[PDB]
């Protein structure tokens, strides 16, 4: 039935907008902005506005949480959609806030909350609808008591709203909007999608899973640094699927007397059984079941064994999924990771720049922000933040704004709506913020693109054939008898864009990029912690398709002498070889190694089934130099009179590092001139108390002066060495004359 | 209302001097002297000498812990500042030390403490006020129980001071000056400022924080070598 449509997550946060696919938009003659009636699961009708988007699937309707709540439906449910051109411009509308959402706020809500709402936009309104207004950094939901043309009405700008205070105590069967949902989670879109595909079907269709008879995911381990809202993920999944949510806190269980912990665990699992389908979330699992060596006491081991017994008895339990949170997979007893136990695993990890932006939007949603704020910039600068760090940063910005405002003044909602946080407050918070994941491995799709290097077309082709083709055309590789190459080795002068090339190829395939710099390999070597190499690959495997980049594979070889009398083999590179051999090609993990000293690289790494391909990354050519200069100056205001093409032509023999140094020196000169001129202007004002930027851009003179400090870090001798290496590799290729008969 | 000024920490240690910012005393019609009768939040009025200082903010009034205590106000509170030119040179002022700050002390307290105090300076006095005198490596707080031109006066060089044993028990409302305060802390001005910014708003305005939707700080971890006065 065309009217039947599957509910789906919304991309536009409007309480009266539902998005439809183009084919179904035209199929049901639904016009843009036309009022549409949606029939709820239990005779809960709501009128909204149709919108069009390409991403929306044909059989799915994008709908926000407010409409879902007043429809008494959840994601994946089926609702009936019918055009409602017979709408009435009702005049008198009676609405009343729910008490629990106004517990503390004072003042005329309509003048501060409902006035921005229902204004400059015709919002379809139905009796009983509960709609959310976000302002004064406090979201308040109002229940529509009634409307003149009951039940459907439109709040025209000339309408009238009647309010009599008396906040309404929320009744049962109505889930509060403050309840966590998928819209309340950011920075884990991939992991959230994985968890959804894991748990929605077992939870949303329990009978369809028990009667059908397949193995459900009984244990999911969400591991990642604390503050990534793993409890938030579990609670949102439970709420959106309608599953009963039971929270087990590790410290709370371990804070009880011996025997009380066992009773609490058993009672939690029994409660989950009673209210199935249900999700048991065990927060801080390592608190309950750490590594067997870290549980000295006998009672602790008994608690771990009790947890294992309950996880094993889950089989008898029906439609009970157990989710647990941990910092790392190695923090918990390995017996918990067996089959029938927390065998499913998800890695929330650090949010990326896009993820951090989503988190900032989520947290700065009720907040009234100044126009100068650009959360994209904050997300870009907030490297090492996990989401609790971002929430703290938003709170700190709000508090600094509150200080700066109330220093000159049971609260005035009008004041809070007037209160606005500016980029100054956010930058102050950034300065005062201490990220909790600064030293966590970064796994993200790089924003670098082929334009940032703009050269080495043959290298682009090789990298594409080696990375993109396996992930984009697995069918082609199966059709022929070829196994995708496991990795490649870049070699060439330092600072010529090897890291840039690896990041560019990772970006083109939209694959995660993991960079293992030379200091990390040297840390493993000095500390004899080569076992950590496993973790690195375990990370890359967890992020497949992934590009695993080793910035300086020759760092350990150099540390031993370009020697120490021994062979080329070393513990860390040996572990890298071991992990590469044990890497399944089905996983799209591609290893890229970079070295300025290909001679001293261990030959074992340059073998079939290993980094067999060797790619020479020479010094950038004129076009590549122009591209590098443009990329470096992308963030800088540069006067148009500067001819970056001429600079590239005259800067032959320069590495990308040298061009970056020239650009940074030009920026230094421009900044120094700006500061000196500002000091001159302020001094002139002081002496003459009776403006324009003297240097708004980096002028030609700045670059001309910077070129006086220009350096060629790669001498012609080094280029000769690299070219001799490449020519040695290429001269052995002496069978091109071969031709069949 | 210009008379409203936000209380702030004091730089000068005199327990009878308040400081304002340069654009304020002229706005309030006050000078380097000009005894001023500040109003407290518990119907408490304290008369003190005005002063000036560049660092003080326009809306901030710097006052010591003694005036704050006898005014029943804390840092960040707002008090009414109004000139009090109708001040009389009281001849006889009867004061009394508090028992909690005189145990083990013997001798003429007036000569020991009240003599170097209330002399070489026309200190204003208000009936019922508590003023602290530091001497003999002790700190004694005296309660002014009576002044001849009630309720406020100025101790002239010829003014007479009266006291006869019978140390007075501190009342519940009064808070001992020996109680720790920001003036009792040194060497962590930056860290103390950080902690103050962290905790003043959540603690000074709890109802606002509950009604408002921001996240208050929950756990602060002060570290450093022992003996730095973290407690």
Curated annotation (Swiss-Prot), chain B:
Changing residue 119 to D: Severely reduced binding to DERL1. ATP 1 binds at residues 226-231. Changing residue 65 to A: Strongly increased affinity for ATP. Strongly reduced affinity for ADP. The modification Phosphoserine is found at residue 16. Coiled coil: none annotated. It comes from the Eukaryota. Changing residue 32 to A: Minor effect on affinity for ATP and ADP. Changing residue 158 to R: No effect on binding to DERL1. It is linked to Inclusion body myopathy with early-onset Paget disease with or without frontotemporal dementia 1: An autosomal dominant disease characterized by disabling muscle weakness clinically resembling to limb girdle muscular dystrophy, osteolytic bone lesions consistent with Paget disease, and premature frontotemporal dementia. Clinical features show incomplete penetrance. Frontotemporal dementia and/or amyotrophic lateral sclerosis 6: A neurodegenerative disorder characterized by frontotemporal dementia and/or amyotrophic lateral sclerosis in affected individuals. There is high intrafamilial variation. Frontotemporal dementia (FTD) is characterized by frontal and temporal lobe atrophy associated with neuronal loss, gliosis, and dementia. Patients exhibit progressive changes in social, behavioral, and/or language function. Homohexamer. Forms a ring-shaped particle of 12.5 nm diameter, that displays 6-fold radial symmetry. Part of a ternary complex containing STX5A, NSFL1C and VCP. NSFL1C forms a homotrimer that binds to one end of a VCP homohexamer. The complex binds to membranes enriched in phosphatidylethanolamine-containing lipids and promotes Golgi membrane fusion. Binds to a heterodimer of NPLOC4 and UFD1, binding to this heterodimer inhibits Golgi-membrane fusion. Interaction with VCIP135 leads to dissociation of the complex via ATP hydrolysis by VCP. The PIM (PUB-interaction motif) motif mediates interaction with the PUB domain of RNF31. Necessary for the fragmentation of Golgi stacks during mitosis and for their reassembly after mitosis. Involved in the formation of the transitional endoplasmic reticulum (tER). The transfer of membranes from the endoplasmic reticulum to the Golgi apparatus occurs via 50-70 nm transition vesicles which derive from part-rough, part-smooth transitional elements of the endoplasmic reticulum (tER). Vesicle budding from the tER is an ATP-dependent process. Belongs to the AAA ATPase family. This is Transitional endoplasmic reticulum ATPase. It comes from Homo sapiens (Human).
